[PDB]
Amino acid sequence: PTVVGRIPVLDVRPVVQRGRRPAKAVTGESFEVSATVFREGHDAVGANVVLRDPRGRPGPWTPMRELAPGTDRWGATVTAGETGTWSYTVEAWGDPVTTWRHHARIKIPAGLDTDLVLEEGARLYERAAADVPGREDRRELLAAVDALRDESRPAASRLAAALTPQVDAVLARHPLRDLVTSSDPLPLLVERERALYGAWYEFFPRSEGTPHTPHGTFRTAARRLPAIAAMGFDVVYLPPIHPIGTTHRKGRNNTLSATGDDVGVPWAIGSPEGGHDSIHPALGTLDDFDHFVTEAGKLGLEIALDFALQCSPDHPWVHKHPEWFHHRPDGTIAHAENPPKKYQDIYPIAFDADPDGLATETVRILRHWMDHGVRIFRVDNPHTKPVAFWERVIADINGTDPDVIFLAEAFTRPAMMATLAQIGFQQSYTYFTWRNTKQELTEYLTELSGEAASYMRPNFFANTPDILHAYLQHGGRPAFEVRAVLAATLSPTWGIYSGYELCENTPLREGSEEYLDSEKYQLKPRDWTRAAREGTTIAPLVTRLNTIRRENPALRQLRDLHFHPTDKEEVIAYSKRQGSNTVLVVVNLDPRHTQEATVSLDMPQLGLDWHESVPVRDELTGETYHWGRANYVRLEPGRTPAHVCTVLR
Amino acid sequence: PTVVGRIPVLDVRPVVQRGRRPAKAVTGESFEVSATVFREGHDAVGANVVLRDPRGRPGPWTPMRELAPGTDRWGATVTAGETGTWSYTVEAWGDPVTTWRHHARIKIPAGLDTDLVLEEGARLYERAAADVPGREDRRELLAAVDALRDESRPAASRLAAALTPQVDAVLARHPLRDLVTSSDPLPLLVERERALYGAWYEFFPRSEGTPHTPHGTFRTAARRLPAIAAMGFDVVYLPPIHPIGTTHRKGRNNTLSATGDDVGVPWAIGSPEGGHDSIHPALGTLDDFDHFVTEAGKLGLEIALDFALQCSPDHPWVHKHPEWFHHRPDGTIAHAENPPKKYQDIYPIAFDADPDGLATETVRILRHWMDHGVRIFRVDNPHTKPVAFWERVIADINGTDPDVIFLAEAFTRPAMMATLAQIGFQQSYTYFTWRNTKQELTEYLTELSGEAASYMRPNFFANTPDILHAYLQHGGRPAFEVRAVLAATLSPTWGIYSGYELCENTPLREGSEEYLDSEKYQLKPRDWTRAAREGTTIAPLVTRLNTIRRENPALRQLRDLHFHPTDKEEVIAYSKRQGSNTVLVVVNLDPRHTQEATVSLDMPQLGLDWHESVPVRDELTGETYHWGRANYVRLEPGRTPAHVCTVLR
Ligand SMILES: OC[C@H]1O[C@@H]2O[C@H]3[C@H](O)[C@@H](O)[C@@H](O[C@H]4[C@H](O)[C@@H](O)[C@@H](O[C@H]5[C@H](O)[C@@H](O)[C@@H](O[C@H]6[C@H](O)[C@@H](O)[C@@H](O[C@H]7[C@H](O)[C@@H](O)[C@@H](O[C@H]1[C@H](O)[C@H]2O)O[C@@H]7CO)O[C@@H]6CO)O[C@@H]5CO)O[C@@H]4CO)O[C@@H]3CO
Ligand SMILES: OC[C@H]1O[C@@H]2O[C@H]3[C@H](O)[C@@H](O)[C@@H](O[C@H]4[C@H](O)[C@@H](O)[C@@H](O[C@H]5[C@H](O)[C@@H](O)[C@@H](O[C@H]6[C@H](O)[C@@H](O)[C@@H](O[C@H]7[C@H](O)[C@@H](O)[C@@H](O[C@H]1[C@H](O)[C@H]2O)O[C@@H]7CO)O[C@@H]6CO)O[C@@H]5CO)O[C@@H]4CO)O[C@@H]3CO
């Protein structure tokens, strides 16, 4: 048995881990299946993609084409349907009809062996007809066979009868395929739309309190949901909602020692009041949590809970499961670190003494929150827990509940980030916040929208509680505006952490990416009504960005993205497409100075000719322009961060 | 069961066809095995390559290192021994000692938890000792354990006892490896030296005749072997040695109709006198062929026969096995074509009616020539016969006779050329003759010496009977000289077709790559004695090039090759290394004008510092120079094509 088949079909992509893990898609998403296909000799080959659904049912006829001449690299676009585990195969075959046609077009006007050539064509078309299941189409090919064989007609007329568009049509859907050879099947995991597309908002329920009771409850926090739904968010991400330890608890601004009223850091999970399956008593009860989830659902919001597999020193696990921790020779457990950062309030888990116990307990915890309507988990720092552990835990949850989405908060080196996605994480955080220049954004989004998109789905948080970038610190509100536009239009999933609207940008100290007076360490009441009234919020821009996304399918996918050149370093331009929808975005990356630029569009990449000039509407303002090959733009920070334009007909 | 192991080890290279075919090497050849290796958390990893021989016996301890910081890409050099099918595995592991050392070096001078830290180190070294098989080395580690634990000594002194070079040495050979995780094994086919390294000469025995008998015999042709051995060739490649058809036989200069004395084209195989298992009666008998092989062997020459799986219309197969040919409707067999070229004297084989019959007969033919001492086959135009057919035929021959080498003469698109090598061809012809500028040579040799070298071994024929390049046509003898130097020093296998020495360069017509009066169509007597006497041959340069190769191991491998910049487009410079041997070549690609250039050497790539200046001998002239960072060279066509320098100590 030979590794290569009769008609070579090699290096089918996408492929993840040499076929040991699936390529990814979501319902409705298109991507390209490709292969290297060729044969011996000089005759033509053809190829097609057979996509099989979870019950092994084949998809539609999907013929491939050569992507660039002489490369023998073939491709076709496939579209994922129903969720589940699919497979795809490339079928390669000799294409004797294409070959015969080419020779016949030369030899017949030249008078060379014409009867022999036409009889050869008749024989191919007879064979074509044999594999055609419909009676009417079979008659069309047999009438072509008869015409080809009618020696009473000129040679040119006999040939023309085999080249009619109706004969073409039949052969396009039912070609004659010699020596069909298929690749071994490759696996495709198709997941729900929210895995790829969604707008996220992170906030701390405890901060949304009242004058009488400053520590918010689930009931007070639910009153913030409508303002979040109105900005057009889909997912609400909550920091840990569990009891918080007292031993080594941190104070305000990450001081070592908490005073008596200090609330501590939610990620320092557990006290005698309960662990990862409990509610912080100040937030209320499980029934209050159910009320919160219900009110979320009614406004079109899903809840994403933080899952941080670690413990405060007061978590029950510390005494009940000591082997879940690494102990030094004096019996102490060293607190967690991501140096030079220290987390004195937190003990990390050791996994090598009782891997089974940890997996069992982890999936029980997740299912408990799942039973209370949580179908999305934002997994804290997963790169400090074993990769195979996440692989197991994710396979177990999605095995019974394939709708559950896991987001990996792994800000680390590329290999690890890539592997976590590859072993099951539906979504990943990214380097976005550290990509601010044109060159950085262009290079990074070319990476994420290319081959990486077969295994990673990016979630572009413009900020997090741990990341207030220098760009926002120095640029003020115009920088917040720019970064919202970029995040919302470049990834089908994006997010902000509360206060981003208010352009909160005071760092702990120069050169830091921590916030001063971080919410991680204190209640952070914000006067939302006042901020709305005084117009010192960019909620309206955020709202419009999410509406634009909801109205334009091109913004709800990742893979189709093209950068168009401008003549100013500070002005970036790009387009995204889905079917007839084309969105074209131009952003001034300078938050302090007005920039003017000539944007030169790659017209064929928009589906247009060079001379063509086609109308656009800037959805940020309602204003209409006519744009083609070369366009003047003028963007003033504070008044116009960018144009976000849709193409109309 | 999880796809990723405890310590991730991913994307092991080399890999061919995702592990379905082996990577290649020859006895004595080094190459790099690499992998992506990392772990969770911030502690160090280590890795090593376990090479297993054909009986499953592990090779030596082969620790890998990170190739560039922060990439998590690790590598080590391995060296192939005995021929056969090997395997390689990468083992990844936590490296707790490296981690502990790093922390201990900081914390001990700082006075932080010193007793605890030193006790932790003692415990690692005790564990280290447990897996150490030698008593003396185990004592060295246990003395380090005791020193670490001696609370009567300063903390700095207790630590220094664990960092002694003798403790280092023990741990370098027997490190403490946590959580060892291996990759699945990948296959490696190791073949004999001649698969990679060898100088080849092609000639037509029939042309080396006498005055009485112009058509040479094996006996007259044997008298040419000494002149070939003296030029330092290892392999003699003969065009087909079988009877030649009469029907549609070609005349001189590829005319359609042969006249009565015309000898026809050897590749038009077969007549009633015999087929592929017979000798042309004008060449003599099988016993004469055995004499020829014996005389070859005595001079250090192996014979490579042409194997062209095709037939003249007079080959016995045409009537005895009609299903081995594709017939048109009137019963005729269309002659072979590689358009716009036509081979009216030749019928191609069809493979789809009796694939088994063709494989059986093909291997019988090969074994017959093998029984007569032919262990190398130059396979004619293999890309017009199915890829899986060669896969089968090669697996069958090498299954009993792994020393047999197949050379694929496939001048076609990259996918096919690559696949043929990948499915078993030991050697391939290449694009060399169409790479003549500096940029072309540099780009092409970077491709062949890189990843392609894991599956392809190039054979650089500077010319063939079908390829007289324009560069030789226009450049005359200085161009022949340049191309000999380039071919001989850039690939460990190279070749010429007879008459290249004589600088034969008259084309059929302008714009053609055929020779005028091609040997394919006629006897081509050459007066070798006269050419030697009159000095109108470049045999002496060829001889010296082969001697240089025989004396410098760096020229007998492929993978180590580096191009150094010069300041003239026409002057190329490069170096190759094997252990202590370094060869440095500078060539003037201009055959009409003297070129002067400053060659700027990449010194660290030579194993040297920038300021260093090290002596070289130009092996073409015996002359000695001192070369470093920046060197004046002056190359005059006719007198000095190039410098071929060896580094001495
Ligand atoms: O026939 C049209 C073609 O002819 C002329 O080019 C010469 C050339 O100057 C010579 O060097 C020589 O070519 C060698 C190559 O040097 C050698 O590499 C090999 O070439 C292979 C390529 O390396 C490989 O990529 C592939 O070729 C593909 C290619 O990627 C495609 O882009 C496409 O090529 C077309 C070109 O795009 C187009 O510009 C034009 O080219 C002219 C050329 O300008 C002219 O000066 O047409 C071509 C072909 O239709 O398709 C090819 C697949 O054919 O594989 C090839 C090997 O086939 O081999 C050749 C000679 O053996 O000779 C050519 C012509 O003899
Ligand atoms: O600490 C030394 C380092 O610190 C300063 O850089 C800033 C930088 O200006 C910010 O952008 C930000 O970095 C982000 C990155 O933008 C983001 O991409 C991600 O970075 C990852 C890389 O993308 C990825 O390649 C890998 O990094 C490797 C890297 O390939 C190696 O070459 C090596 O990096 C070293 C550099 O070679 C060396 O120049 C120096 O770098 C300075 C930097 O000049 C300074 O201005 O030291 C580094 C590291 O020792 O090793 C790394 C592996 O760490 O993976 C990284 C992710 O770790 O993430 C960061 C922030 O999350 O912040 C940095 C510092 O915070």
PDB file of N, CA and C and ligand atoms in Angstrom, chain A residues 412-414 431 434-435, chain B residues 69-70, ligand 2:
ATOM      1  N   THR A 412       1.440  35.504  27.189  1.00  0.00           N
ATOM      2  CA  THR A 412       2.682  34.788  27.380  1.00  0.00           C
ATOM      3  C   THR A 412       3.314  34.619  26.042  1.00  0.00           C
ATOM      4  N   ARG A 413       4.200  33.637  25.875  1.00  0.00           N
ATOM      5  CA  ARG A 413       4.906  33.529  24.605  1.00  0.00           C
ATOM      6  C   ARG A 413       4.008  32.854  23.565  1.00  0.00           C
ATOM      7  N   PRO A 414       4.326  33.040  22.274  1.00  0.00           N
ATOM      8  CA  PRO A 414       3.452  32.549  21.208  1.00  0.00           C
ATOM      9  C   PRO A 414       3.211  31.048  21.245  1.00  0.00           C
ATOM     10  N   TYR A 431      -2.223  39.927  21.969  1.00  0.00           N
ATOM     11  CA  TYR A 431      -1.292  41.023  22.189  1.00  0.00           C
ATOM     12  C   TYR A 431      -1.877  42.402  21.839  1.00  0.00           C
ATOM     13  N   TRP A 434      -0.848  45.873  23.100  1.00  0.00           N
ATOM     14  CA  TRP A 434       0.538  46.271  22.805  1.00  0.00           C
ATOM     15  C   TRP A 434       0.774  46.391  21.312  1.00  0.00           C
ATOM     16  N   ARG A 435      -0.291  46.600  20.560  1.00  0.00           N
ATOM     17  CA  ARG A 435      -0.177  46.886  19.141  1.00  0.00           C
ATOM     18  C   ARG A 435      -0.922  48.208  18.864  1.00  0.00           C
TER      19      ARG A 435
ATOM     20  N   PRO B  69      16.696  32.994  21.879  1.00  0.00           N
ATOM     21  CA  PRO B  69      15.932  33.184  23.130  1.00  0.00           C
ATOM     22  C   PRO B  69      14.429  33.531  22.936  1.00  0.00           C
ATOM     23  N   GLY B  70      13.581  33.047  23.837  1.00  0.00           N
ATOM     24  CA  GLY B  70      12.130  33.302  23.779  1.00  0.00           C
ATOM     25  C   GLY B  70      11.319  32.683  22.641  1.00  0.00           C
TER      26      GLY B  70
HETATM   27  O1  LIG C   2      11.705  42.687  29.452  1.00  0.00           O
HETATM   28  C1  LIG C   2      12.635  43.059  28.427  1.00  0.00           C
HETATM   29  C2  LIG C   2      11.882  43.754  27.266  1.00  0.00           C
HETATM   30  O2  LIG C   2      10.970  44.794  27.844  1.00  0.00           O
HETATM   31  C3  LIG C   2      10.546  45.932  26.978  1.00  0.00           C
HETATM   32  O3  LIG C   2       9.541  45.645  25.923  1.00  0.00           O
HETATM   33  C4  LIG C   2       8.131  45.940  26.269  1.00  0.00           C
HETATM   34  C5  LIG C   2       7.426  46.272  24.929  1.00  0.00           C
HETATM   35  O4  LIG C   2       7.838  47.561  24.453  1.00  0.00           O
HETATM   36  C6  LIG C   2       5.886  46.238  25.001  1.00  0.00           C
HETATM   37  O5  LIG C   2       5.380  46.148  23.659  1.00  0.00           O
HETATM   38  C7  LIG C   2       5.357  45.045  25.834  1.00  0.00           C
HETATM   39  O6  LIG C   2       5.659  43.804  25.136  1.00  0.00           O
HETATM   40  C8  LIG C   2       4.510  42.971  24.896  1.00  0.00           C
HETATM   41  C9  LIG C   2       4.647  42.609  23.405  1.00  0.00           C
HETATM   42  O7  LIG C   2       4.326  43.713  22.594  1.00  0.00           O
HETATM   43  C10 LIG C   2       3.792  41.432  22.991  1.00  0.00           C
HETATM   44  O8  LIG C   2       4.170  41.006  21.661  1.00  0.00           O
HETATM   45  C11 LIG C   2       4.117  40.288  23.920  1.00  0.00           C
HETATM   46  O9  LIG C   2       5.485  40.030  23.468  1.00  0.00           O
HETATM   47  C12 LIG C   2       5.785  38.618  23.153  1.00  0.00           C
HETATM   48  C13 LIG C   2       6.570  38.575  21.816  1.00  0.00           C
HETATM   49  O10 LIG C   2       5.645  39.014  20.821  1.00  0.00           O
HETATM   50  C14 LIG C   2       7.174  37.176  21.491  1.00  0.00           C
HETATM   51  O11 LIG C   2       8.145  37.227  20.415  1.00  0.00           O
HETATM   52  C15 LIG C   2       7.835  36.577  22.749  1.00  0.00           C
HETATM   53  O12 LIG C   2       8.994  37.386  23.145  1.00  0.00           O
HETATM   54  C16 LIG C   2      10.314  36.762  23.172  1.00  0.00           C
HETATM   55  C17 LIG C   2      11.170  37.383  22.017  1.00  0.00           C
HETATM   56  O13 LIG C   2      10.811  36.828  20.731  1.00  0.00           O
HETATM   57  C18 LIG C   2      12.678  37.189  22.261  1.00  0.00           C
HETATM   58  O14 LIG C   2      13.464  37.854  21.251  1.00  0.00           O
HETATM   59  C19 LIG C   2      13.077  37.624  23.693  1.00  0.00           C
HETATM   60  O15 LIG C   2      12.756  39.024  23.982  1.00  0.00           O
HETATM   61  C20 LIG C   2      13.803  39.764  24.654  1.00  0.00           C
HETATM   62  C21 LIG C   2      14.255  40.757  23.577  1.00  0.00           C
HETATM   63  O16 LIG C   2      14.939  40.055  22.523  1.00  0.00           O
HETATM   64  C22 LIG C   2      15.124  41.876  24.164  1.00  0.00           C
HETATM   65  O17 LIG C   2      15.204  42.895  23.164  1.00  0.00           O
HETATM   66  C23 LIG C   2      14.541  42.436  25.499  1.00  0.00           C
HETATM   67  O18 LIG C   2      13.258  43.096  25.261  1.00  0.00           O
HETATM   68  C24 LIG C   2      12.900  44.195  26.153  1.00  0.00           C
HETATM   69  C25 LIG C   2      12.281  45.356  25.335  1.00  0.00           C
HETATM   70  O19 LIG C   2      13.183  45.860  24.328  1.00  0.00           O
HETATM   71  C26 LIG C   2      11.799  46.460  26.294  1.00  0.00           C
HETATM   72  O20 LIG C   2      11.500  47.678  25.607  1.00  0.00           O
HETATM   73  O21 LIG C   2      14.361  41.360  26.470  1.00  0.00           O
HETATM   74  C27 LIG C   2      13.311  40.461  25.956  1.00  0.00           C
HETATM   75  C28 LIG C   2      12.734  39.454  27.000  1.00  0.00           C
HETATM   76  O22 LIG C   2      13.758  38.969  27.881  1.00  0.00           O
HETATM   77  O23 LIG C   2      12.378  36.803  24.689  1.00  0.00           O
HETATM   78  C29 LIG C   2      10.910  36.956  24.640  1.00  0.00           C
HETATM   79  C30 LIG C   2      10.206  36.109  25.762  1.00  0.00           C
HETATM   80  O24 LIG C   2       9.855  36.902  26.913  1.00  0.00           O
HETATM   81  O25 LIG C   2       6.806  36.576  23.794  1.00  0.00           O
HETATM   82  C31 LIG C   2       6.473  37.885  24.324  1.00  0.00           C
HETATM   83  C32 LIG C   2       5.522  37.793  25.553  1.00  0.00           C
HETATM   84  O26 LIG C   2       6.264  37.510  26.719  1.00  0.00           O
HETATM   85  O27 LIG C   2       3.920  40.584  25.385  1.00  0.00           O
HETATM   86  C33 LIG C   2       4.563  41.793  25.928  1.00  0.00           C
HETATM   87  C34 LIG C   2       3.945  42.216  27.292  1.00  0.00           C
HETATM   88  O28 LIG C   2       3.015  41.216  27.739  1.00  0.00           O
HETATM   89  O29 LIG C   2       5.939  44.950  27.143  1.00  0.00           O
HETATM   90  C35 LIG C   2       7.407  44.782  27.043  1.00  0.00           C
HETATM   91  C36 LIG C   2       7.858  44.564  28.493  1.00  0.00           C
HETATM   92  O30 LIG C   2       6.672  44.505  29.313  1.00  0.00           O
END
